[PDB]
Amino acid sequence: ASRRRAMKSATDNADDLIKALTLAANRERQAQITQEISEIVGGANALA
Amino acid sequence: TAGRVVRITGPVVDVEFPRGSVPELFNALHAEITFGALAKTLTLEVAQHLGDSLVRCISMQPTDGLVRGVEVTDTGASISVPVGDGVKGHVFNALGDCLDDPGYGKDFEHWSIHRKPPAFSDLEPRTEMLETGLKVVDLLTPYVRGGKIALFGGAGVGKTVLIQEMINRIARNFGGTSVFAGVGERTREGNDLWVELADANVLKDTALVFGQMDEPPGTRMRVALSALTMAEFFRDEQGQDVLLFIDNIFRFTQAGSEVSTLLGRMPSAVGYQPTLADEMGELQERITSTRGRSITSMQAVYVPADDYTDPAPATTFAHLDATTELSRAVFSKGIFPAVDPLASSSTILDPAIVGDEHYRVAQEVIRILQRYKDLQDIIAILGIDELSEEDKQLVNRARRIERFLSQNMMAAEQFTGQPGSTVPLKETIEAFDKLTKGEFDHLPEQAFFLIGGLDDLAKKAESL
Amino acid sequence: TAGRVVRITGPVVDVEFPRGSVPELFNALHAEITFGALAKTLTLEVAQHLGDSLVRCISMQPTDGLVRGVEVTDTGASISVPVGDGVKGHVFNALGDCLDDPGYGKDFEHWSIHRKPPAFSDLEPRTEMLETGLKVVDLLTPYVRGGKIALFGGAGVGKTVLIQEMINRIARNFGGTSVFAGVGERTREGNDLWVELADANVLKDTALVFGQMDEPPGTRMRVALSALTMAEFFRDEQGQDVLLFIDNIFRFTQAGSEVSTLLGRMPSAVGYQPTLADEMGELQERITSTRGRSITSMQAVYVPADDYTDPAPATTFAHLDATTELSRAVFSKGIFPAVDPLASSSTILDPAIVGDEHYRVAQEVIRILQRYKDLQDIIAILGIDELSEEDKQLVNRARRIERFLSQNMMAAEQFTGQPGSTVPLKETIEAFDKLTKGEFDHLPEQAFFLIGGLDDLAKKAESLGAKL
Amino acid sequence: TAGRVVRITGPVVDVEFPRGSVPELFNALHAEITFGALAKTLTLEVAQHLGDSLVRCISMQPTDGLVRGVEVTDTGASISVPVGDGVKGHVFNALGDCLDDPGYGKDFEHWSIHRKPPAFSDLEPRTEMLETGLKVVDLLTPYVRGGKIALFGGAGVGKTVLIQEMINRIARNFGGTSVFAGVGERTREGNDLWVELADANVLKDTALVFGQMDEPPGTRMRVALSALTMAEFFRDEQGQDVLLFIDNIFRFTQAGSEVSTLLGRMPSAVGYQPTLADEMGELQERITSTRGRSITSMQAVYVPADDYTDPAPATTFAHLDATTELSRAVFSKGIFPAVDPLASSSTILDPAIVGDEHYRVAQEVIRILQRYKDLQDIIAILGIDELSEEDKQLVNRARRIERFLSQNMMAAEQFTGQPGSTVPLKETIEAFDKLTKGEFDHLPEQAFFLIGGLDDLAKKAESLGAKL
Numbered sequence A: 001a002s003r004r005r006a007m008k009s010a011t012d013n014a015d016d017l018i019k020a021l022t023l024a025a026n027r028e029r030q031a032q033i034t035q036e037i038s039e040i041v042g043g044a045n046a047l048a
Numbered sequence B: 001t002a003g004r005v006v007r008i009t010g011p012v013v014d015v016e017f018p019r020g021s022v023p024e025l026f027n028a029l030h031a032e033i034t035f036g037a038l039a040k041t042l043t044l045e046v047a048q049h050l051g052d053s054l055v056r057c058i059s060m061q062p063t064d065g066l067v068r069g070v071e072v073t074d075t076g077a078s079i080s081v082p083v084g085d086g087v088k089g090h091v092f093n094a095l096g097d098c099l100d101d102p103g104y105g106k107d108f109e110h111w112s113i114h115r116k117p118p119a120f121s122d123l124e125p126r127t128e129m130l131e132t133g134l135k136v137v138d139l140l141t142p143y144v145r146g147g148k149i150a151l152f153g154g155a156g157v158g159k160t161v162l163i164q165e166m167i168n169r170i171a172r173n174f175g176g177t178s179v180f181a182g183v184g185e186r187t188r189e190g191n192d193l194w195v196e197l198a199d200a201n202v203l204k205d206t207a208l209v210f211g212q213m214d215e216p217p218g219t220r221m222r223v224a225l226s227a228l229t230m231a232e233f234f235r236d237e238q239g240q241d242v243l244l245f246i247d248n249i250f251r252f253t254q255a256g257s258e259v260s261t262l263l264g265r266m267p268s269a270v271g272y273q274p275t276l277a278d279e280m281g282e283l284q285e286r287i288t289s290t291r292g293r294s295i296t297s298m299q300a301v302y303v304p305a306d307d308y309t310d311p312a313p314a315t316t317f318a319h320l321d322a323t324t325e326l327s328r329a330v331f332s333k334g335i336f337p338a339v340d341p342l343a344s345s346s347t348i349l350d351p352a353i354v355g356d357e358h359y360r361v362a363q364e365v366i367r368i369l370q371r372y373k374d375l376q377d378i379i380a381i382l383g384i385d386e387l388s389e390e391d392k393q394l395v396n397r398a399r400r401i402e403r404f405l406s407q408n409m410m411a412a413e414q415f416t417g418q419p420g421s422t423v424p425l426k427e428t429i430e431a432f433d434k435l436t437k438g439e440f441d442h443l444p445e446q447a448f449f450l451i452g453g454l455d456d457l458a459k460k461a462e463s464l
Numbered sequence C, D: 001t002a003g004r005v006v007r008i009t010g011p012v013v014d015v016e017f018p019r020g021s022v023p024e025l026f027n028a029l030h031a032e033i034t035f036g037a038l039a040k041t042l043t044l045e046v047a048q049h050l051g052d053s054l055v056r057c058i059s060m061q062p063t064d065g066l067v068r069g070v071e072v073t074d075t076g077a078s079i080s081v082p083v084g085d086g087v088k089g090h091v092f093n094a095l096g097d098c099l100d101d102p103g104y105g106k107d108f109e110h111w112s113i114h115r116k117p118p119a120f121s122d123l124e125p126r127t128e129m130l131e132t133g134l135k136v137v138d139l140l141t142p143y144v145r146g147g148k149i150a151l152f153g154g155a156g157v158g159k160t161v162l163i164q165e166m167i168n169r170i171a172r173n174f175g176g177t178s179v180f181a182g183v184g185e186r187t188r189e190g191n192d193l194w195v196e197l198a199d200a201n202v203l204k205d206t207a208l209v210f211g212q213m214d215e216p217p218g219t220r221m222r223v224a225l226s227a228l229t230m231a232e233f234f235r236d237e238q239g240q241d242v243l244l245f246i247d248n249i250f251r252f253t254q255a256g257s258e259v260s261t262l263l264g265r266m267p268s269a270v271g272y273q274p275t276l277a278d279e280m281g282e283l284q285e286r287i288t289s290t291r292g293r294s295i296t297s298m299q300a301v302y303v304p305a306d307d308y309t310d311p312a313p314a315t316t317f318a319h320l321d322a323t324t325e326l327s328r329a330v331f332s333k334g335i336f337p338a339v340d341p342l343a344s345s346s347t348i349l350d351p352a353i354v355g356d357e358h359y360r361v362a363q364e365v366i367r368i369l370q371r372y373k374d375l376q377d378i379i380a381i382l383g384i385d386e387l388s389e390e391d392k393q394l395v396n397r398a399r400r401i402e403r404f405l406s407q408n409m410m411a412a413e414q415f416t417g418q419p420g421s422t423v424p425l426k427e428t429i430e431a432f433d434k435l436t437k438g439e440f441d442h443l444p445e446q447a448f449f450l451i452g453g454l455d456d457l458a459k460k461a462e463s464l465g466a467k468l
């Protein structure tokens, strides 16, 4: 019984961890796109 | 007083006009490509006044074969689409040209696709429910009359059949009409939809406006406004209730981003156009209820990288009133429409809007279905034997509830000859209240497939 | 010999002068805004020589209402602020105008707010603990008297409360003078500090200079220089021991970034000004103690978006002898001060200076906390029940240690009504030695939360039913 | 008819010529730096025609000391390098000058370093294994004779050690000519390679062309072309097999991107030049075997920041027949060569060429290692006891397999102090077939670390107390 409870708790903890990690990964992905565009447009403006 | 092309860079064309003849922003201009292979009339939309009598315009067609110095004619108005009852049953592109019958509708009344939303006073302060007649939609995810509905669902989930069902219900129950806006429409899928609507005999109640995948970004940006203009004429002038379908709204956003990039504007966060919120708001605010008539919109939404915080879905959901998710799992069970009662939601499923009885019944149904979903994994792995007696009772009740959310739809008649049903909202509320309380658990499961209200349930139980 | 405004772009103004009368860099020019509600006298600071007798200047006041072509006069000198004993007990803005008593200080000696830092031959490293009574600070990040301390933190993690705590602990029992620099922070916070210093009788020894959030970026990037000029007068011209409090220096960096954008400079990484390290270094190198002349400076450093990799705090780090990094994670645990013990550091936490016992206890505490941090990965999923017996013991010890590093602060009473406590350094070392040895493993965790020394621990443990 | 320097900005020089005397693109121009300390002759490669008789050129030598308006002479031709058997045994730079014997080869036939690649009709796919004696390479990344081999990896993972190992194993007994192109690498490594080749007596058969990382961008751009021109001459004129070693080819792309913005080109993604793929394609497509004419080329490709998705290595991948991909993770485990067996690939690793048994054993090894990679996280968190019995057995097998793919290389004796070993391909196949069947599960995994064949395995197991 306690193993069932502990594994339910660990599965919920893994759910929360995956959610938080996915949010962090999406934030990092958006930030990377923004920074790449920033560098590209900065270079383009410098050339202009 | 005619202009001449000075610069051509892909779809972006610079045109010079005399001093007193500079067209207003968003005016439609006509140039000519005379090269035999690619001959056509080119539509340009004024995007910027560069000064020195130069305007920067977006070509609505490919500029391949265009020459510097050719004449450009100002039409004196923005892109104008034909309106009236005559647009029903026909396919148009973003410029108003009829595709199934070139030249058709050229004599109709023409309305500019750039219009403001209803004045602040003209709006209805009270949100109203759109009683569709479908049990699942009415109960769990009620639609807002004049609001926006997001539609999510893969292939083979009845999405097209659901669209046909909604067209049927708006045409018959409300005496309204439908406008379909295919933004970034695949040509094969557009042809499929045209043929299917003709076969379902609902094309007469629908106006199709396609801005296809293989057109420059300008048409894909303006097709939504064109379809919305047709719907606005039906609402304000014909005094009808309109249903506007947009597939895909994200492609409207992406075409806006592409146009913004083509015009040299610096991209905003995540590379979208700086005015993403402004454009989405200008589109969405025109969909509303004004003066007793409404445009209700069901919009297919694509979520990039499944990231709901992405700027495009983040901006789109600022205007969405309800969500309907179509599930492969539900469809495989034979439950039509294959709505996911747990993933789907509505913003007006609150006691203050739909009343306390409806809220309580819907909440109880959701609770029972969620518990059944929790037990699904146990049932799959260890079988139903390991379940408790209360668990078995709840599983049976939840199976009957989830099967009573199915309905014999109007658009499903052409597949299964049986005609569709329209369950009144109060009838659905009381029926699902009884189901939750446990007043039908003795009846067999098969009796709950694809029926209307309680009368149909009784008849199907007797037939078994 | 007067100039004329030719271009206006927000707080930046281009002024054309007759050939041969172009003002020198950093000269203070004056222009007039005459429109009724916004009528004022703009002080501009020459920032660039654009050529063709044009100069680009930064306006200290907002430029709303300024008209092209109005004459601009050159003062012939840079911005100057009043200095002397008379500035103590008074509130000044970036330009030296007294706010509590307008017109005050006009007769004082006036010093340019731009000057070079002390000569390298005059610099002598400072290695002397400045005891505070805060367990975490004294143990893990001892502050240096006459050195530079910084408080890094994200939004709302406790930088200002800790600055008030250090004003309470250090400035009150201070022989010399204090200078506070409100740099781009809340105006009502400046008002609260003014009133609190008046109540505590410390105001008579303190000079307050305020350029707050509702200021143009030029003022927000020059007010620090003005306050530092007053502190430098006290250090050099009077041999007084000076306390310098800056809150917030990231606001100086951010104002510099805004100005750089307005000056047409090419953006650097993350959109910051290319001369970020240069400006930061000039300002910081002016803030120092020289041989025989002590400035104990303490600076709050905002961390944008809780991103400690941001260029502004990242560049700030190098200019410090002691760094207290405040963590959102620690703050969420309710631990105050929300100090990240692993990330924070002190340059004098070495055995030669603080002694072998202090150093050994600090290193043991850090080792336990680092092991706990490493185990976080397993723990988040599985609790502590899957760890070895040694790891379980270490994790319980680490929880107790991290709770005990918290403290009931003097400046926290206004939030909790609980009076603060001061812990002697020897008691702190002894307590954490015992705690690392496992002598308090039997006490409940909450007994260690927001208390003073071992006596408070005993009383709280008793109150919870446990016995020490 | 001579031009004059108009603009100088780092390695890029603008030169104005009289109308009708504008040099053709890629022509070599000469300018004089007369300043005594840095006096020299700059070679400039015409990169662009700017209109109005101005050309933008890339300097091959540092432009420090260059003066505006100095005469610029057009050689009327591209950069050309000596070709022929004479270049064997000698060290050159990108410009063709001999470094060990200055003035040598000036009278040889000279070939332009710019050349079109072979016609498509002359290309024949190569499918013939080139046995090396390295277990991992021969089993999972079989090299192709006359094909293109690459060694990918981040900084300091063993690319150069593996290049030297392959020199030892392949060029030591090669019956043809060897060309080593040091593209933008350490000068110390170049000197070490020169000395090693002289000692091994392989230098007599090798032509070395060096452009180091201290050279300006133009030299690093053109050194690969120079060495490739020597190789092309040996392929097309002498009609003998050629070994082409390039280290590091990424430096060509990096140097190209260093001048891209100075040449006026808007940057592409990740800061690279817009023409990355096209320039790389031209250069790489010149590095090929043609029907009846063999060039076995081996390139070291640096992966910036270990990011295999970076556009440079990603674009390079399409040009290779075999790719040994070195991993930082494998390196940090002490496994050498730090080959990632799950990420490397060979075009001839299929049953048709290598044979049924080789392909079967390779696929089984890859499957076991993939399953182990999947189970790594579970073992790290929940431990190995919670795995199924077959999964535990597979984990033991996979650990032994990953250790056994390690090998003591000759080129690594300077690091491990242990002499290298050579394993025949058949022995490798038999040993890994035994491993995948569990025939060595009773031996400690430490017995499989940095050894040769099964004899070395038996010896090490005896040394550790085991026996097969």
Ligand SMILES: Nc1ncnc2c1ncn2[C@@H]1O[C@H](COP(=O)(O)OP(=O)(O)OP(=O)(O)O)[C@@H](O)[C@H]1O
Pocket: C153, C154, C155, C156, C157, C158, C159, C160, C161, C162, C302, C336, C337, C409, C411, C412, C415, C416
């Ligand atoms: N020692 C403390 N005890 C209790 N509460 C505290 C303590 N320190 C800070 N707080 C709480 O945290 C709030 C924020 O603290 P503080 O204003 O010092 O943060 P900050 O880092 O300067 O913030 P900001 O970025 O907004 O300027 C305080 O108003 C108080 O609510």
Ligand SMILES: Nc1ncnc2c1ncn2[C@@H]1O[C@H](COP(=O)(O)OP(=O)(O)O)[C@@H](O)[C@H]1O
Pocket: B153, B154, B155, B156, B157, B158, B159, B160, B161, B336, B337, B409, B412, B415, B416
């Ligand atoms: N109520 C229903 N009765 C019978 N068949 C249905 C019903 N709903 C959906 N289907 C079947 O499911 C398929 C769904 O495909 P389609 O209508 O294109 O929607 P989607 O775009 O989600 O695939 C259709 O081919 C249709 O035959």
Ligand SMILES: Nc1ncnc2c1ncn2[C@@H]1O[C@H](COP(=O)(O)OP(=O)(O)O)[C@@H](O)[C@H]1O
Pocket: D153, D154, D155, D156, D157, D158, D159, D160, D161, D162, D336, D337, D409, D412, D415, D416
């Ligand atoms: N086979 C090996 N055995 C032991 N150490 C090695 C081996 N290969 C590389 N190393 C270590 O890794 C370092 C990096 O190798 P090298 O190839 O020179 O760098 P890179 O991979 O960047 O070219 C070597 O100097 C050596 O110390």
Ligand SMILES: [Mg+2]
Pocket: C159, C160, C161, C185
């Ligand atoms: Mg604060």
Ligand SMILES: [Mg+2]
Pocket: D159, D160, D161
């Ligand atoms: Mg190397």
